[PDB]
Symmetry: C2
Subunit: 290 residues, 2 copies
């Protein structure tokens, strides 16, 4: 029952004071180093949170703020999803798919996945958009999850499953994006997913912005390569129940598709998934892919 030797929380100094820092990956390793998480997702998140709370208590330290936990829970959910997605393509034996948890736009802009030709197409768009009196851009956060269909990206090292959470295992899932840098043909990118532990009426609209901007960059590519068949879909996924009001908001259109009376309107977010269990991650990936 000894919790005082845990490293899921770290001490550091700032302005002559000792401060507390949650180490979200350490919490995952210290709970899941023999087996990867199973059952209800939300409960595992609360379990991890109550674990760090017990640790700080046992060490006699100040409880981390709600913001620290907001941040921390976001990472847990993403890593749970990234690991489950890694194992999905192994057990399904998807020789030509990758599901990749992306870092932030500054560490690695998702545009860097694309081959030289496609990056130049996007550079032409970006540069022309700035060639006006009123300069415009197309900025969004990196998608949390990207689904890429390209057979020659898959190496045999990806075909070893993750049965336990180590520093080494979490590292490989979270640096997967590095292997595909400058290698994806434009239509290899088939889907992205936004991952949220919970939704708010304000925060759910960030999923619409994301889908809208991504589908707008993709529609440019479809015209630059005059391909009417290639599709890019954008999805949402919550760990909580999704309400009617959440559902309506996320039916919102990618606005460039609704200008004309005889256009068929596209949703910016094609579907929203309520991931109750780890089995639901597999279910979600089944729908997105097949």
């Amino acid at each position: 029952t000894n919790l005082t030797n845990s490293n899921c929380v770290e001490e550091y100094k700032e302005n002559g004071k000792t401060k507390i820092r949650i180490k979200p990956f350490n919490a995952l390793i210290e709970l899941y180093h023999h087996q990867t998480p199973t059952g209800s997702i939300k409960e595992n998140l609360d379990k991890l949170e109550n674990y760090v709370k017990d640790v700080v208590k046992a060490k006699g330290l100040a409880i981390p703020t709600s913001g620290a936990f907001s941040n921390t829970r976001g990472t847990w959910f993403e890593v749970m999803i990234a690991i489950q997605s890694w194992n999905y393509r192994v057990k399904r034996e998807l020789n030509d798919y990758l599901i990749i948890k992306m870092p932030n736009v500054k560490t690695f802009d998702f545009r860097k996945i694309f081959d030289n030709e496609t990056r130049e197409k996007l550079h032409q768009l970006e540069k022309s958009l700035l060639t006006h009196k009123q300069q415009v851009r197309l900025i969004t956060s990196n998608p949390d999850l990207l689904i890429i269909r390209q057979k020659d990206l898959i190496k045999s090292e990806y075909n070893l499953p993750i049965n336990k959470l180590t520093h080494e295992n979490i590292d490989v899932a979270l640096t997967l994006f590095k292997d595909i840098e400058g290698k994806c043909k434009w239509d290899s990118l088939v889907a992205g997913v936004g991952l949220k532990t919970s939704l708010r009426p304000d925060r759910r609209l960030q999923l619409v912005h994301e889908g809208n901007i991504l589908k707008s960059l993709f529609a440019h590519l479809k015209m630059a390569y005059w391909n009417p068949k290639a599709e890019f879909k954008y999805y949402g996924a919550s760990s909580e129940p999704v309400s009617k009001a959440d559902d309506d908001a996320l039916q919102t259109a990618a606005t460039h598709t609704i200008v004309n009376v005889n256009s068929t309107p596209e949703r910016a977010v094609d579907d929203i998934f309520s991931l109750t269990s780890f089995e639901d991650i597999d279910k979600m990936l089944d729908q997105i892919i097949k």
Copy 2:
């Protein structure tokens, strides 16, 4: 120095426990009942926050959570802006403008401001968007601030300035939206503003969604009334410094304007204002209006 008789915090029961509730309007009245706020905005917000914090301390009660303050600060800033905007149109003598702090989409959907003819134009769009296999919508939060140019809406009661914050004064500013219900011609709506005490890379993109959706509803109206001259602009306003990265994000395009090579692209958010002082609110309104 007696803080124990203050009503800026309220006690209420929930599951056999006594809970604390900030009363954000009471905090404003108890600080500004002789004169309306002046000087630096951010400092007045911190002043109001430190006032309720001193009150709970003096009463020996639990300090409200950061979420309670997040909520509370949002209301203070909006009311400060609403009151300053009320006084702006008086001192400028804008006989044909109203600046209105809107409630939420459920209390009063901003679409209800419009006259019967324009509401039917939007109902045709909404209903047709649902008349597909994949149903789509155009959902956003209500704009925080709306600027309406229509001379016949202005009554003489609006021309009395607000020199002190009472329950009665805050009520009139915050129910102003009720007077214009079903009265605005479509092109009377000239601007909306999103008001934020601070920005985040995620949260600032909600201003882009808002602008994008609003300009998409307005572009429909421009076509339904075949008017190439009518404009609707969308603006942001922070109480903190705005960074280069905030600036870039909010240069993002209303995506329906960038489809074609010879389109002139429009920003979804036309400008972002950093409101340091109350004088800056006046400055901002000067640019938006004239």
